[PDB]
Structures are given as structure tokens and as C-alpha cells.
Design a protein around this motif. Structure first.
Motif, short mmCIF file in Angstrom:
data_model
loop_
_atom_site.label_atom_id
_atom_site.label_comp_id
_atom_site.label_asym_id
_atom_site.label_seq_id
_atom_site.Cartn_x
_atom_site.Cartn_y
_atom_site.Cartn_z
N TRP A 117 -5.78 -14.58 13.93
CA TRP A 117 -5.88 -16.03 14.09
C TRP A 117 -6.51 -16.26 15.46
N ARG A 118 -7.51 -17.14 15.51
CA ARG A 118 -8.23 -17.43 16.76
C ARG A 118 -7.78 -18.76 17.36
N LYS A 119 -6.49 -19.05 17.19
CA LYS A 119 -5.91 -20.30 17.66
C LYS A 119 -4.44 -20.01 17.92
N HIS A 120 -3.81 -20.83 18.75
CA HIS A 120 -2.41 -20.60 19.12
C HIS A 120 -1.36 -21.36 18.31
N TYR A 121 -1.73 -22.51 17.75
CA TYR A 121 -0.81 -23.30 16.94
C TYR A 121 -1.03 -22.97 15.47
N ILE A 122 -0.01 -22.38 14.85
CA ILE A 122 -0.09 -21.86 13.48
C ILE A 122 0.92 -22.62 12.65
N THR A 123 0.51 -23.07 11.46
CA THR A 123 1.42 -23.81 10.60
C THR A 123 1.87 -22.94 9.44
N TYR A 124 3.09 -23.19 8.96
CA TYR A 124 3.51 -22.58 7.71
C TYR A 124 4.18 -23.59 6.80
N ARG A 125 4.23 -23.24 5.53
CA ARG A 125 4.81 -24.13 4.56
C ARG A 125 5.54 -23.31 3.52
N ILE A 126 6.73 -23.77 3.15
CA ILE A 126 7.46 -23.08 2.09
C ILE A 126 7.10 -23.77 0.78
N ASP B 232 15.13 -21.66 4.77
CA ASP B 232 14.48 -22.25 5.94
C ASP B 232 14.80 -21.47 7.21
N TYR B 233 16.08 -21.16 7.43
CA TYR B 233 16.50 -20.50 8.67
C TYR B 233 15.98 -19.06 8.77
N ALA B 234 16.07 -18.31 7.67
CA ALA B 234 15.54 -16.93 7.62
C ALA B 234 14.05 -16.89 7.98
N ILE B 235 13.27 -17.77 7.35
CA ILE B 235 11.82 -17.80 7.61
C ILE B 235 11.55 -18.22 9.07
N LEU C 146 16.22 -11.43 3.18
CA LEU C 146 15.00 -12.24 3.32
C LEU C 146 14.43 -12.19 4.73
N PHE C 147 15.27 -12.42 5.74
CA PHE C 147 14.80 -12.41 7.14
C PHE C 147 14.01 -11.12 7.47
N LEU C 148 14.60 -9.96 7.18
CA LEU C 148 14.00 -8.67 7.57
C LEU C 148 12.67 -8.43 6.86
N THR C 149 12.65 -8.74 5.56
CA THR C 149 11.44 -8.63 4.76
C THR C 149 10.37 -9.58 5.30
N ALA C 150 10.79 -10.79 5.68
CA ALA C 150 9.85 -11.79 6.16
C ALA C 150 9.25 -11.42 7.53
N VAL C 151 10.04 -10.76 8.38
CA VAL C 151 9.51 -10.27 9.67
C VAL C 151 8.32 -9.35 9.41
N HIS C 152 8.49 -8.41 8.48
CA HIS C 152 7.44 -7.49 8.06
C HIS C 152 6.24 -8.23 7.45
N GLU C 153 6.49 -9.09 6.45
CA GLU C 153 5.42 -9.86 5.79
C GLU C 153 4.63 -10.71 6.78
N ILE C 154 5.34 -11.39 7.68
CA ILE C 154 4.65 -12.21 8.69
C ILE C 154 3.81 -11.33 9.62
N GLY C 155 4.29 -10.13 9.92
CA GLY C 155 3.46 -9.16 10.65
C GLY C 155 2.09 -9.01 10.00
#
Ligand SMILES: COc1ccc(S(=O)(=O)N(CC(=O)N=O)C[C@H](O)CO)cc1
Ligand SMILES: [Ca+2]
Ligand SMILES: [Ca+2]
Ligand SMILES: [Ca+2]
Ligand SMILES: [Zn+2]
Ligand SMILES: [Zn+2]
Length: 158
Positions: free
Chosen positions: A4-13, A26-29, A107-116
Motif C-alpha cells: 500500500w502506497r498510503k498510510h490510511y487504510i480502510t477495512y470493511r466486514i 469486530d473486536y478480533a478483526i 479468528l484473531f490469530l488467523t486474521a493476524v496472518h491473513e492481514i499480513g
């Protein structure tokens, strides 16, 4: 590869697994994004509508991307590296049983990896790294990135 070539990144569930309480998804993500913002200049914000950089999806089997899921077990989740369209998106196999704890798939642990991956990281050969492509539960209350994860992400950002 891509970053990403920008600092503000959005996400959506996009949608919510019935395996968990909504607030706990929500909290895990949120917590999983924080792991990465902790060690980079990135800032992450959840948006409720419109196009996000990173769309978080729960789905089973074939789900529109040519990366079909395989039922319970095996592939738990996958994600796309930075880019337009589906780039950045993180998909979680609804055929797993997602949880806040040691049961099912955390979910949290898996999401850390996926977001990586959503940020541009590939897999690590180091079993200690969150980016190691084998799921193994670790206590989430005290979780920390490995040296390898930090060097990997800091090679891309910051
Ligand atoms: C701790 O975080 C994770 C650990 C493993 C997996 S996984 O689904 O098991 N994985 C696919 C993958 O790497 N997706 O990004 C590995 C193999 O393909 C199947 O074992 C996902 C997240
Ligand atoms: Ca699966
Ligand atoms: Ca996207
Ligand atoms: Ca499920
Ligand atoms: Zn997918
Ligand atoms: Zn992976």
C-alpha cells in the motif's frame, strides 16, 4: 511485491460468521489490525459502507474468486496482496468454527496472518512466525509477532 502506497487504510466486514457474537468478530478483526499498526506507520479504520481497501469475507466452498475452500479443516483462510479491486481482501472459510478462544479456529490469530498477506507479506519458514503457513493455537491475550514477522513487515513499511 505490492505494498500500500498510503498510510490510511480502510477495512470493511462484508458479512459475519454465525459461529461468533457480532461484537467478538469486530473486536478480533480490530485487534488483528492493531498488531500490524503497532509496528508500521499504517492506520486502519473500519468503514460500514462503500469500497474498502481490505474487505473481510466469510464464505464456504466456491465463492467467486478461483480459490475455492475445502470444507472443515485444511485451508482455513486466504488473502490477496495489496492492489485494486479484490487486492487486500481477506477471506475466511465458513466451514471452520471460528472462536475467541482455544476451541475451533481462533479468528484473531488467523486474521493476524491473513492481514499480513493483505499488507504484502508472504509465508515464513520459521515455525515461530505468525506468517508460518500452519495453524497452531497460541494464547491470544499475550500473543506477539516473531522477530521474523517484524523484519518482514518493516522491510515493506516504516
Ligand atoms: C495463523 O494463521 C494461519 C495459519 C494457517 C492458515 S491455512 O489456512 O492453514 N494456510 C492457508 C494460508 O496460508 N492462507 O493464508 C496454510 C495451508 O495452505 C493449509 O494448512 C491460515 C492462517
Ligand atoms: Ca477449510
Ligand atoms: Ca480490496
Ligand atoms: Ca462456521
Ligand atoms: Zn476467496
Ligand atoms: Zn497464509
Amino acid at each position: 511485491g505490492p505494498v500500500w502506497r498510503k498510510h490510511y487504510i480502510t477495512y470493511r466486514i462484508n458479512n459475519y460468521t454465525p459461529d461468533m457474537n457480532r461484537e467478538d468478530v469486530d473486536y478480533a478483526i480490530r485487534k488483528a489490525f492493531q498488531v500490524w499498526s503497532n509496528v508500521t506507520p499504517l492506520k486502519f479504520s473500519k468503514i460500514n459502507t462503500g469500497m474498502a481497501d481490505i474487505l473481510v469475507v466469510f464464505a464456504r466452498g466456491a465463492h467467486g474468486d478461483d480459490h475455492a475452500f475445502d470444507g472443515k479443516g485444511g485451508i482455513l483462510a486466504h488473502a490477496f496482496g495489496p492492489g485494486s479491486g479484490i487486492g487486500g481482501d481477506a477471506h475466511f472459510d465458513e466451514d471452520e468454527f471460528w472462536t475467541t478462544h482455544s476451541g475451533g479456529t481462533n479468528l484473531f490469530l488467523t486474521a493476524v496472518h491473513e492481514i499480513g498477506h493483505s499488507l504484502g507479506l508472504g509465508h515464513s519458514s520459521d515455525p515461530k512466525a505468525v506468517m508460518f503457513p500452519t495453524y497452531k493455537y497460541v494464547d491470544i491475550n499475550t500473543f506477539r509477532l516473531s522477530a521474523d514477522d517484524i523484519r518482514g513487515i518493516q522491510s515493506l513499511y516504516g
